[PDB]
Design a protein around this ligand. Structure first.
Ligand code: FAD
Ligand code: FAD
Lengths: 530, 557
């Protein structure tokens, strides 16, 4: 059990914990996955749902960064392919091998047909891939147009193909939390930290239950802040400090596969003389692409896509594919996110052109803060967190904290061997936990057999409190299967209403929430009503 | 024989019947062209204003550098091209460019460096791979600070973090030109030194020959030829301007560079060393061992003035001494410690730099072009690409001889045509030197000298060994005498400096022993040519001037 039941118990049990963690993203989720495995009594709190922050709004990939070889920044490339190795090892059901395609042009560079080849050999050598079935290779201008029919011809010299990975971020967070649960940790989502319990120090926190206006006080030896782009907002809860962050907005658009077919990931130049590059990626029967870099000020819980972000991106896909003719009217889904950057770094520092871009400082009040960084280095940042924690529990309290190896502790649903039609999907999506799903496959009105269990499983096991957490973060219904959402939408909500036995007004408020969300995704407010 | 006598017969033939190809300039670029034309059957002539190599081909860095710096901006094709042609040159002249691994120390207090301990490793591995060197006896390796000071205890310690060691070659530029020249002569080419082109001959607006002046006798002759190719290095514009019937746009813009020599006890470096100037100007300086000395440079300044005898300025010297005194803090080197030196002009095409050499169509930085009047010009390039430059030129030459006159020519593989003294298995230099040295010992020479001469002359050591067997000149050792006699009869020595400066390492690298042999060498050449007493006194005054300039006597006041 891991639902609203397990939830209420947790809240009560936290009524002096060893460690309190603020933030339920990939960062907070990684700290706990390790602390629990090491003994510490831990109690984490996530203001909204799990992973509903930036950790569900990224490019959704694990790019190697081959681009860095242009300035011979070889140590950065080695770290990256190296850490990417661990993760794939501790979560064999999430990041998957999805070789990428990099076309070469003499009209417009970065590499030529001769240099891409040597760049890809140094890449596989550092990645220790050199030899396996995923070894790089090149393509002739003829054999490139085959795979991608609408790809610009004027000036095509061919292309290169090297290893890269697909990675659902939301699932990475949840299966880390679900493993943190199994190890006894008070994980409470939908609970917001609103104040601090103080002489001059910090001994506790005062949280609010967003499900019930009840205010509780928490007691713990140490309080660590891992609120991502919210790092400063959480800090300022202590009424004198200065800013440490400066986030940027990036967005993505989505279209039907037949409006822009691409059998594999494709990286290329914008063509607007700004040095930026763009992706066009496949994902089920769709193809999404992007992204975007712009200073942002306003609401952090729901950043919005505008006309100018659309203009910019359309001008890019239309130049790289002159035969597509894509307009605002072709987009079926979308999303926006904010990058947790420290004053000084930029968005291009993610792929070229304590951890790289992150820090772990301790405030004078005694608050630990882990900021910046990037999802691909989540496990690595937490190991550096558990260090200033296993030492801080002794030099001040004398607790015998254990020692582990995060690089080898496999998480939820993925404990099998690394080199491991709707039961096929279920296996390759939940991995191991697909076993528990089958046992449950007593359907529901308007739904299907399989779709019933994946919903029941969410409620029983994935802390599904609201319907949106299911169609958005626990599965790919809203973002990649829009054209199938309207014949499962109402049914799903009623099974939720049933399981929770909400009420005729709690049910009304919920549905109201799905309306606002789906609409902002489908940019109805821009289309002057679709 | 290849001497003043051969010279005089060549001068008559070039006047008897028309040539198919006449070459202007006897440095590495013309020597290169001459060898490939001769081997192909093309009747060939070549004229050189001074001695062979007296221009910029005897004034370079005397190294064959790989260009590992180019990996910093991932310019891999340039590096592949360079290590690849270096292997090709070693195959045709295994007795000149030799292996001599480079030491590259790493520092953290310098601010903005090229590589760090982590990055030099992946750079040296990529370097060896591109050069098919990984898996051989010269594959790279790194050193720790304490390992570095073990080899050079006098290197700046503040910040030293270790070193990288990778493969590179030492190269004698003057000996490389003359062994290409000797090969061309053996294959029939008419080669004349101390002969200057002073004008063109015409039939309409079309060049059909050259008027040449014999600098030794004030005589002026006419040479008829089907094609004329200009390979005069930094003098490329000045030669093109011998056509006064048409002013023309300049292609060149030469820069100057110098090199200084001190005795090794003053800067003991066991192997070549490469480092930052410390003047944050983006440049690098070398410290290299040669015989029992250490030489260092170089500089890079815009120039105007006489092209035949460029001079070292006090400003060139202070720039270099500031670099060495910063890199080795206890050595304290000043002008008084310098015993020899040289300066030359880079043949750059308007728009290029000395920097592009080491990462500071035909080949990088060169061009092959024909003028409206029929004159062909081959300009730019660098010494390490000489054979590749001659190949592109021969390609156009055969195509013009067939089309315009119906003349078929044999196609040779220049990548395998070994030059003078280099006819032996390139992978077995030491075995070949061990054997030849025996033939030398059985001739009356000592162990040290026979090995030297075999390593320096290669196969040609046998002729040196034969003459040795047969008559020491007054004041000279059996060994020295045999080298000089070989010089006069087989290497076209015509004046004292040709021998002490370019055929041997006497002036530059053994200055401390030059006085013992200076006069005996002039006397032997004097009697051998049978000079008037007035002629000898002038050949003497001229050599003294060359020594005064190397010694930096004026600056020293
Ligand atoms: C456009 C874009 C592209 C990206 N591309 C890459 C990439 O290519 N490679 C890469 O490695 N990374 C990439 N990233 C970055 C990566 O997604 C983030 O670094 C990562 O998701 C940050 O995780 P986090 O847990 O620190 O922050 P979040 O995921 O935002 O989690 C922090 C949580 O704190 C919670 N919180 C805030 N205040 C409170 C409070 N008062 N009480 C309780 N909880 C609170 C919030 O609800 C939030 O869920 C990209 C990001 C963006 C925006
Ligand atoms: C300081 C310095 C550093 C350098 N660094 C490098 C390096 O690291 N790597 C590299 O590969 N290269 C390097 N170079 C360049 C290399 O030395 C030259 O490219 C090469 O020697 C030039 O060949 P060249 O034969 O074209 O000219 P040259 O040797 O100059 O010869 C041209 C010849 O034609 C003759 N001539 C002129 N006019 C007439 C006439 N009217 N009649 C008859 N003959 C005439 C001249 O007397 C001369 O002998 C460097 C040069 C310098 C000076």
């Amino acid at each position: 059990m891991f639902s609203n039941k397990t939830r209420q118990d947790s809240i009560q049990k936290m009524q002096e914990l060893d460690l309190l963690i603020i933030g339920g993203g990939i960062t907070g989720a990684g700290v706990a996955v390790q602390a629990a495995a090491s003994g510490i009594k831990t109690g984490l709190i996530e203001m909204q749902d799990f992973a509903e922050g930036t950790s569900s709004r990224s490019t959704k990939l694990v790019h190697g960064g081959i681009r860095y070889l242009k300035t011979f920044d070889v140590e950065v490339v080695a770290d990256t392919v190296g850490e990417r190795a661990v993760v794939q090892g501790i979560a064999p059901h999430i990041p998957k091998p999805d070789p990428m395609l990099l076309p070469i042009y003499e009209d417009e560079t970065t590499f030529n047909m001769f240099s891409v080849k040597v760049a890809m050999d140094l890449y596989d050598k550092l990645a220790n891939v050199t030899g396996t079935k995923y070894e790089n290779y090149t393509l002739t201008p003829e054999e490139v147009l085959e795979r991608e029919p609408f790809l610009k011809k004027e000036g095509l010299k061919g292309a290169g193909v090297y290893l890269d990975f697909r990675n659902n971020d939301a699932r990475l967070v949840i299966d880390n939390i679900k493993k943190a649960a199994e190890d006894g940790a008070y994980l409470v989502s939908k609970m917001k930290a609103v104040g601090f319990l103080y002489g001059d120090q910090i001994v506790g926190v005062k949280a609010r239950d967003l499900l019930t206006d009840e205010v509780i006080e928490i007691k713990a030896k140490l309080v660590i802040n891992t609120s991502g782009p919210w790092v400063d907002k959480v800090r300022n809860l202590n009424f004198p400090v200065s800013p440490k962050m400066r986030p940027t907005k990036g967005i993505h658009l989505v279209v039907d596969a037949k409006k822009l077919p691409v059998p594999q990931p494709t990286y290329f130049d914008t063509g607007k003389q700004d040095g930026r590059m763009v992706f066009a990626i496949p994902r089920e029967n769709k193809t999404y692409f992007g992204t975007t870099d712009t200073d942002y000020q306003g609401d952090f819980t729901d950043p919005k896509v505008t006309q100018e972000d659309v203009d910019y991106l359309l001008d890019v896909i239309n130049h790289r594919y002159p035969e597509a003719n894509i307009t605002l009217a072709d987009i079926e889904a979308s999303w926006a996110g904010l990058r947790p950057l420290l004053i000084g770094n930029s968005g291009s520092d993610y792929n070229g052109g304590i951890s790289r871009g992150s820090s772990l400082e301790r405030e004078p009040d005694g608050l630990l803060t882990l900021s910046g960084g990037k999802i691909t280095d989540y496990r690595k940042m937490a190991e550096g967190a558990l260090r200033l924690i296993r030492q801080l529990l002794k030099e001040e309290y004398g607790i015998e904290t254990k020692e582990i190896d995060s690089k080898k502790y496999q998480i939820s649903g993925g404990n099998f061997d690394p080199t491991k039609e709707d039961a096929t999907y279920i296996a390759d999506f939940y991995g191991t936990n697909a076993r528990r799903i089958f046992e449950l496959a007593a359907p529901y009105p308007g739904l299907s057999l399989a779709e019933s269990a994946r919903l029941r499983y969410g409620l029983e096991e994935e802390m599904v409190l609201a319907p949106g957490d299911y169609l958005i973060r626990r599965t790919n219904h809203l973002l990649f299967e829009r054209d199938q959402l309207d014949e499962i939408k109402q049914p799903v909500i009623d099974a939720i209403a049933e399981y929770f036995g909400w009420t005729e007004e709690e049910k009304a408020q919920q549905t109201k929430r799905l309306e606002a969300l789906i609409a902002e995704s489908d940019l109805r407010e821009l289309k002057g009503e679709k």
